Design a protein around this ligand. Sequence first.
Ligand SMILES: *[C@@H]1O[C@H](CO)[C@@H](O[C@@H]2O[C@H](CO)[C@@H](O[C@@H]3O[C@H](CO[C@H]4O[C@H](CO[C@H]5O[C@H](CO)[C@@H](O)[C@H](O)[C@@H]5O[C@@H]5O[C@H](CO)[C@@H](O)[C@H](O)[C@@H]5O)[C@@H](O)[C@H](O[C@H]5O[C@H](CO)[C@@H](O)[C@H](O)[C@@H]5O[C@H]5O[C@H](CO)[C@@H](O)[C@H](O)[C@@H]5O)[C@@H]4O)[C@@H](O)[C@H](O[C@H]4O[C@H](CO)[C@@H](O)[C@H](O)[C@@H]4O[C@H]4O[C@H](CO)[C@@H](O)[C@H](O)[C@@H]4O)[C@@H]3O)[C@H](O)[C@H]2NC(C)=O)[C@H](O)[C@H]1NC(C)=O
Ligand code: I3P
Ligand code: NAG
Length: 559
Amino acid sequence: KFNDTLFGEMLHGYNNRTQHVNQGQVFQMTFRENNFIKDFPQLADGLLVIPLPVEEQCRGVLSEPLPDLQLLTGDIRYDEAMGYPMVQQWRVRSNLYRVKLSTITLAAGFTNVLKILTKESSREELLSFIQHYGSHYIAEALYGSELTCIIHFPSKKVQQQLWLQYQKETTSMPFITYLSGLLTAQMLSDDQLISGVEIRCEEKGRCPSTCHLCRRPGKEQLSPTPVLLEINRVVPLYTLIQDNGTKEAFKSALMSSYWCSGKGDVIDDWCRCDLSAFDANGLPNCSPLLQPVLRLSPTVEPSSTVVSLEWVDVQPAIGTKVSDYILQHKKVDTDLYTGEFLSFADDLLSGLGTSCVAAGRSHGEVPEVSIYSVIFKCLEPDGLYKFTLYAVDTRGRHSELSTVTLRTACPLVDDNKAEEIADKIYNLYNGYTSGKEQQMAYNTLMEVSASMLFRVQHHYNSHYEKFGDFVWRSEDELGPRKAHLILRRLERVSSHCSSLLRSAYIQSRVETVPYLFCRSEEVRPAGMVWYSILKDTKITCEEKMVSMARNTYGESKGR
Ligand SMILES: *[C@@H]1O[C@H](CO)[C@@H](O[C@@H]2O[C@H](CO)[C@@H](O[C@@H]3O[C@H](CO[C@H]4O[C@H](CO[C@H]5O[C@H](CO)[C@@H](O)[C@H](O)[C@@H]5O[C@@H]5O[C@H](CO)[C@@H](O)[C@H](O)[C@@H]5O)[C@@H](O)[C@H](O[C@H]5O[C@H](CO)[C@@H](O)[C@H](O)[C@@H]5O[C@H]5O[C@H](CO)[C@@H](O)[C@H](O)[C@@H]5O)[C@@H]4O)[C@@H](O)[C@H](O[C@H]4O[C@H](CO)[C@@H](O)[C@H](O)[C@@H]4O[C@H]4O[C@H](CO)[C@@H](O)[C@H](O)[C@@H]4O)[C@@H]3O)[C@H](O)[C@H]2NC(C)=O)[C@H](O)[C@H]1NC(C)=O
Ligand SMILES: O=P(O)(O)O[C@@H]1[C@H](O)[C@H](O)[C@@H](OP(=O)(O)O)[C@H](OP(=O)(O)O)[C@H]1O
Ligand SMILES: *[C@@H]1O[C@H](CO)[C@@H](O)[C@H](O)[C@H]1NC(C)=O
């Protein structure tokens, strides 16, 4: 049977790769020594439970708002006027205990199988051990009750307004409960600043009755049992062997299961894949080559004509080495057709290239994982684009492909000029007679972009619709064909843009933002069947600036 007790997972052993607790039973649980806490039963022997100080108990932290990274990876749809959807995390910890184990004798069943395997130096056998008993034991861990909530805002603007609205009306109440207050009360009203806000919570261990920051209507509880939150320290199970012969042989079998998919031995830095780990094309397949997830840049919203993309390097610390990232891109309108092919190594770092595409490599969250990025600066406005990415290892395997599809923004529209043209056109149509008027009316309407034409229509109909609609009146004064040529131009504007271009007012802000521009100093030595490691390529990185003109849409000019 399964011996379960509180604190709990400390005595059972932990796998690093699969991240699972309760893997076999490493240490024995006994009840000779008398360890109690509060309302909890008798603790197992040799584990030290220390409640965290009153400063840490029932404290909540609101994170800074950031774009929703989940919504920047696939088919990327978001309102251009809104911007990136934002998320903000709220987290409250309540029933906290720090749990260490010292000192405990080994389990009966653990030492039995440890006695028989010690002499029996076998690979398939040592892996079956790790499957059952895991790789480490947990040394230090944090238990308690945490409520983690995520507030999903539809835009960066909508938050800022709500945060400032909250900050005015509070100066008592947490930000999340103020929002939840207005969310639940909205059954009384309808559309407002809070329209698209959503809160999503996930609890690990139920909220105690005493703590008021994690209280949710039905779910309160008197003295809840603490749940594992963090694993602070792990120690490998080869510490427990007590002899130099087996604990070296076990260690190498552990490294095989972690780094080389259990189908190969690890030489310093790389996996020697035993045959036939090798794939369909006969290339070493024991170390996994992961899918690189192509993302939109969180800090740079794509404009019309300008898109910048990111991805985190898929290279493990040990095993596979990535030699290149292949990045294809096309404009759709097609399907299953190949876009312009770009080798990161060869086309983006080495061959210009510029000033339309630029690439960059940078140090990530915690080094050393690299953050590759590429920026497209000569794309076409109101266009749907598909970008795909895959990695290529040192021996020539491709990774699983990854995709991003997105629309570039609407083209810029001088809204003053549009309303001016509309009046010019109306006064010509009230002039009637002249063939110069007719020609010059037709010329000015055709000379300006389709979006501008759609906007002059919007204005023309706002004012002069009672005396004849824009198309109808264009047909009367310019004749059947010229009016149909005008009409057709308006068809070239998309559904998204035509919606946005019916706004009350359009204004133009100009953001100016930095991007990393890197070039290859050193052309690296490549073989026929093996290639050079991309990460080792010496590069010279310079910061540059893009100016990004955007339209700003609204029902009035006060934002
Ligand atoms: C869970 O589970 C598990 C448990 O355990 C875990 O696992 C782990 O992990 C970790 C992390 O990742 C790891 O660690 C790591 O490792 C790695 C690898 O290592 C190895 O190898 C290497 C290599 O080398 C090379 O080079 C050299 C020169 O010097 C030579 O010698 C050699 O040879 C090589 O080469 C190669 O080979 C050949 C030739 O012959 C050919 O093929 C070619 O050439 C190639 O290349 C090394 O280095 C090492 O070594 C070590 O050890 C030994 C014994 O064993 C000794 O003898 C030595 O001395 C050493 O030691 C020392 O040093 C080192 C360094 O410094 C250190 O570490 C130590 O401590 C001592 O001191 C081995 O063998 C590595 O690489 C890494 O490192 C890195 O990273 C870090 C962080 O982490 C840092 O700090 C450092 O610095 C580095 O960095 C660098 O690099 C990188 C890479 O790429 C980059 O990126 C950066 O930038 C820089 O530059 C580490 O260390 C481990 O191992 C593992 N373990 C096991 C058992 O498995 C996991 O993790 C977990 N998980 C979680 C927690 O999550
Ligand atoms: O020492 P160099 O000039 O870089 O070249 C090495 C050489 O081409 C080896 O044949 C190759 O192993 P395989 O061709 O057998 O894969 C090795 O890969 P490795 O160092 O990643 O094992 C290369 O690094
Ligand atoms: C349960 O604990 C006993 C010690 O009383 C131990 O002998 C037994 O093997 C444990 N069960 C498992 C599955 O480890």
